[PDB]
Design a protein around this ligand. Structure first.
Ligand SMILES: [K+]
Ligand SMILES: [Mg+2]
Ligand SMILES: [Mg+2]
Ligand SMILES: [Mg+2]
Ligand SMILES: [Mg+2]
Ligand SMILES: [Mg+2]
Ligand SMILES: [Mg+2]
Ligand SMILES: [Mg+2]
Ligand SMILES: [Mg+2]
Ligand SMILES: [Mg+2]
Ligand SMILES: [Mg+2]
Ligand SMILES: [Mg+2]
Ligand SMILES: [Mg+2]
Ligand SMILES: [Mg+2]
Ligand SMILES: [Mg+2]
Ligand SMILES: [Mg+2]
Ligand SMILES: [Mg+2]
Ligand SMILES: [Mg+2]
Ligand SMILES: [Mg+2]
Ligand SMILES: [Mg+2]
Ligand SMILES: [Mg+2]
Ligand SMILES: [Mg+2]
Ligand SMILES: [Mg+2]
Ligand SMILES: [Mg+2]
Ligand SMILES: [Mg+2]
Ligand SMILES: [Mg+2]
Ligand SMILES: [Mg+2]
Ligand SMILES: [Mg+2]
Ligand SMILES: [Mg+2]
Ligand SMILES: [Mg+2]
Ligand SMILES: [Mg+2]
Ligand SMILES: [Mg+2]
Ligand SMILES: [Mg+2]
Ligand SMILES: [Mg+2]
Ligand SMILES: [Mg+2]
Ligand SMILES: [Mg+2]
Ligand SMILES: [Mg+2]
Ligand SMILES: [Zn+2]
Lengths: 23, 123, 69, 155
RNA sequence: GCCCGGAUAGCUCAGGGUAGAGCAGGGGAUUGAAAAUCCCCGUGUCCUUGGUUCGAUUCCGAGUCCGGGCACCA
RNA sequence: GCGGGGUGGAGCAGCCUGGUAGCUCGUCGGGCUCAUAACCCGAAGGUCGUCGGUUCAAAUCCGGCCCCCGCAACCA
RNA sequence: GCCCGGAUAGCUCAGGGUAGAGCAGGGGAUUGAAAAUCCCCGUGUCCUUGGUUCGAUUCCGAGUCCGGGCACCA
RNA sequence: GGCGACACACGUGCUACAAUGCCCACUACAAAGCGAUGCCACCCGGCAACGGGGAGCUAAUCGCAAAAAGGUGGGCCCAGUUCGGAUUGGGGUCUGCAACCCGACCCCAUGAAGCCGGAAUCGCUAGUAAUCGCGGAUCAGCCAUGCCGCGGUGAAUACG
């Protein structure tokens, strides 16, 4: 869910990247 | 008590089942199976005792888990209180520790609302 | 012993994950176990597992003495 | 709507069955404006009603609609010292809306796990006169029949 | 002590092939509120036992237990 | 002298028949209202006058003490 | 004269580790300014004496200012 | 130092309670804006926040840039769960003189309440509501889930 930083959707929501959402 | 001290649920995949252990999130699950060479998608019911002990042996020796981890977490909080920093003081009264507001909310730390009389109005 | 009410104890072999094998007596002929005396951390030497830490803290911190003199 | 009647919307007939009533039905399935997703469900349900009980889905769907159509209903009204439960007949437009609305509602209360199955099964039971949406329709008609005493209060 | 009665759903009571209705409870419609009204649903060896029947809450022998009723008390 | 009574803040159940403290109002939080009342939705508060006893267990049964009401006190 | 009960701030009254409420008065918030409400402050040898107690407004023993009751007789 | 307090009470919101959903991989289609101790292509180090390099652009040219819901494939199988992501332990990163009170991120671990919400109450009549992402102003950084905007997909109903 959007409040879960440990996910793609979550990093998108917070507008950030990382292991769980790469660029 | 199969592994580590807990019985991970059969009829689910290993990678998920390992998570039910205190100290294993999904990330350590993927890595442990890779490092020991077992399919992440195989139901716990369907593991050779060879797979079982190999997976078991790895997991317990690689990371500190369950009780030991809880104890180590407990010692840390205990340390903060005894010194005792502002962080330690917060643990004493069971308030948030990471700078959240307490005028509202904070229910997870504070618990259920203990309602109290307010201030009456004139007539 | 009283007839009829007790379960038979028979020669039995208990097997651990560490390959340990125990020759004893039980109600079950063969039994497989996750741990035993031979491989349990507390029993075996002091096999301190993952935690060598003690604990570490606080001034193993070091890193370093860089702030000047 | 004080001034004039509301224009009744005309909807584009669906691409597969070429039926406007199908379109309206697709709309009641649609949540959050995901029409594409909703259209799949209906069409996939149509696949299912095709293989189970081998009739033409369109004929099954249309039949299920007619059966859930309420001829009568109670509608609140006035009158001074109390608001009565007055039995009024249902307009063809309203008849259609309700059955489609209920059909989805009963469909989403079915126990089956996935949507296309729920829709298909409710449509199957509803065409055969069984099913939740039908039960509502009969309920509504019972209430209307029941308050026949306050008929003269109708407009 | 003898007759005349009953037991049936949480309550109130109705009746060879049957299992009821009214209220309580539940949801829904309705609403300012409280009801009222309306639609649906839940609540049984029809006290126990033993028999008649093709079978029975039902007939009957029967025991349990509250109903009544009438007499007597050295 | 004899009878009854003492239990959430108020007024009353519960005791006879030991195990389970209830009802109306009041109080506290929230709704409706421009606002108050009425009203509607939630919640808290009584270890039962005290001491002693019986009992596995006492508001409850038995005593003792403090109260609080009521009735009596006649023949001279 | 004989039993029971109250003496606690200026008033009216709660209640074993020198204690409170209201009201009165002073501030302060509120207000256009007031009322009301809310907040804060001052308030005292807790009637006298003896006793018990490390410790008494508190428990005791009296006493006291006063409050309900007892009183020819035939 | 405090405006960031916390037994409590209200408003406006964010994220959810899941299968018309969640996840991983792969693959598309916007608009309006911003940008010279600025936006930063691409290369390499790091699981990563980032770091070192290092072109292009004073910008209809260079860059922020990937739009997301969607589409395709597979996994999950009704579980307080691969739903939810609060709380807490630990380890890091960056701005900054300085993140104790009191920053935003990243990673490992933790994985709370929540099973659709009492009385009550809000918005919207069409490219609207719902849902999905994008940008800007303020600004070192940022507690923005706020605000002002931009498009994507796209309803239901109005008897009276
Ligand atoms: K006389
Ligand atoms: Mg998740
Ligand atoms: Mg785990
Ligand atoms: Mg704070
Ligand atoms: Mg032997
Ligand atoms: Mg007889
Ligand atoms: Mg009855
Ligand atoms: Mg009292
Ligand atoms: Mg009383
Ligand atoms: Mg009463
Ligand atoms: Mg009594
Ligand atoms: Mg009793
Ligand atoms: Mg109130
Ligand atoms: Mg005005
Ligand atoms: Mg009021
Ligand atoms: Mg007594
Ligand atoms: Mg006792
Ligand atoms: Mg008791
Ligand atoms: Mg006792
Ligand atoms: Mg003034
Ligand atoms: Mg004295
Ligand atoms: Mg004197
Ligand atoms: Mg402020
Ligand atoms: Mg918000
Ligand atoms: Mg900017
Ligand atoms: Mg859980
Ligand atoms: Mg729970
Ligand atoms: Mg989870
Ligand atoms: Mg930390
Ligand atoms: Mg800081
Ligand atoms: Mg569920
Ligand atoms: Mg939902
Ligand atoms: Mg309009
Ligand atoms: Mg969403
Ligand atoms: Mg934004
Ligand atoms: Mg900023
Ligand atoms: Mg913050
Ligand atoms: Zn062993």
């Amino acid at each position: 869910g959007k409040g879960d930083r440990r996910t793609r959707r979550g990093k998108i929501w917070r507008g950030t990247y990382g292991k769980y959402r790469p660029r | 008590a199969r592994i580590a001290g807990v019985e991970i649920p059969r009829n689910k995949r290993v990678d998920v089942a390992l998570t039910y252990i205190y100290g294993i999130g999904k990330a350590r699950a993927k890595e442990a199976l890779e490092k020991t060479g077992i399919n992440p998608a195989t139901r716990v019911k369907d593991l050779t005792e060879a797979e079982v002990v190999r997976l078991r042996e790895y997991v317990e020796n690689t990371w500190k888990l369950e009780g030991e981890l809880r104890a180590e977490v407990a010692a840390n909080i205990k340390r903060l209180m005894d010194i005792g920093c502002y962080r330690g003081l917060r643990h004493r009264r069971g308030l948030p520790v990471r700078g959240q507001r307490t005028r509202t909310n904070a229910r997870t730390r504070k618990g259920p609302r203990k309602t109290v009389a307010g201030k009456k109005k004139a007539p | 012993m009283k007839e009829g009410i007790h379960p038979k104890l028979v020669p039995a072999r208990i097997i651990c994950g560490c390959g340990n094998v125990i020759e004893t007596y039980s109600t079950k002929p063969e039994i497989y176990v996750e741990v035993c005396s031979k491989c349990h951390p507390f029993y075996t030497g002091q096999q301190r597992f993952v935690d060598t830490e003690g604990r570490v803290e606080r001034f193993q911190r070091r890193y370093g003495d860089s702030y000047r003199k | 709507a004080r001034r004039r009647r509301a224009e009744v919307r005309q909807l584009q007939p669906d691409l597969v069955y070429g039926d406007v009533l199908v379109t309206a039905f697709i709309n009641k399935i649609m949540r959050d404006g995901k029409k594409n997703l909703a259209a799949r469900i209906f069409y996939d349900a149509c696949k299912i009603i095709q293989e189970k009980t081998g009739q033409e889905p369109l004929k099954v769907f249309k039949q299920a609609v007619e059966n859930v159509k309420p001829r009568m209903e109670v509608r609140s009204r006035r009158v001074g010292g109390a608001n009565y439960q007055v039995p009024m007949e249902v307009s063809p437009r309203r008849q259609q809306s309700l059955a489609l609305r209920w059909l989805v509602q009963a469909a989403n209360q079915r126990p089956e796990r996935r949507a296309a199955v729920r829709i298909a099964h409710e449509l199957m039971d509803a065409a055969e006169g069984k099913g939740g949406a039908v039960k509502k329709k009969e309920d509504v008609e019972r209430m209307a029949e029941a308050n026949r005493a306050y008929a003269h209060y109708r407009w």
